[PDB]
Specification:
Length: 207
């Protein structure tokens, strides 16, 4: 009964109003947002490793929310909050501009079929919305195990003034410590790891 037990402590309800991060987290500290955290393994690991920072997760799949809460409770985390609501609405309504150190989007629904391509969350307007919530120097880190989606993500992100690709080859980045290795990955495999990480830093507009 993880939801029932831990939602009152770590859950954050949808609101028409902006979040006050100091009020929510009881301190002034960097805030990282993970969108679509699934069962929250990455988010819990990240919060556990960074007690000095604060973490917000959003996930519409409520069993994933419950799994994340159960794990967060088991790990004794005080620096994690979760939401169960459309992330785009949360960004629009509740996340203040220029407030986030990092936004993570790991394995967003890849929508393999061409007819479903518009359902993919990484599109220009979404990426711009995320950018507006990053502090300058903040980073949007996404990952996918589907190359067509990786290429699409790269095209979207490369087209937006104010995002600087942190890839030294102008495409993809090495997996950072802040994303755990997954089962979709053969690290060091001759044909590639099987997961594409993209990281872009928010920089001042060039135009
Ligand atoms: C393929 S799963 C990956 C989950 C997790 N990051 C992982 O790697 O295991 C994609 C997740 O994104 C969530 N998701 C899709 N759209 C969302 C949205 N608009 N707001 C919040 N979560 C969303 C889904 O519910 C799903 O759990």
């Amino acid at each position: 009964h993880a939801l029932e037990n831990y939602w009152p402590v770590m859950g954050v309800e949808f609101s028409e109003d902006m979040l006050d991060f100091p009020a929510l987290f009881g301190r002034e500290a960097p805030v990282t947002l993970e969108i679509g955290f699934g069962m929250g393994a990455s988010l819990v690991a990240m919060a556990k490793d960074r007690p000095e920072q604060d973490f917000l997760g959003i996930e519409v799949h409520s069993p994933g929310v419950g799994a994340c809460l159960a794990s967060a409770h088991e790990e004794g985390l005080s620096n994690l909050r979760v939401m169960c609501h459309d992330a785009v609405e949360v960004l629009h309504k509740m996340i203040p501009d220029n407030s986030l150190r990092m936004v993570q989007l790991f394995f967003p629904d890849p929508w393999h079929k061409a007819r479903h391509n518009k359902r993919r969350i990484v599109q220009v307007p979404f990426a711009e919305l995320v950018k507006s919530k990053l502090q300058l120097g903040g980073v949007f880190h996404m990952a996918t195990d589907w190359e067509p989606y990786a290429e699409h993500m790269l095209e979207v992100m490369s087209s937006i003034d104010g995002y600087k690709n942190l890839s030294e080859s102008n495409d993809y980045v090495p997996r950072p410590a802040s994303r755990p290795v997954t089962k979709f990955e053969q690290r060091g495999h001759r044909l590639g790891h099987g997961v594409w990480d993209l990281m872009f830093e928010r920089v001042k507009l060039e135009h």
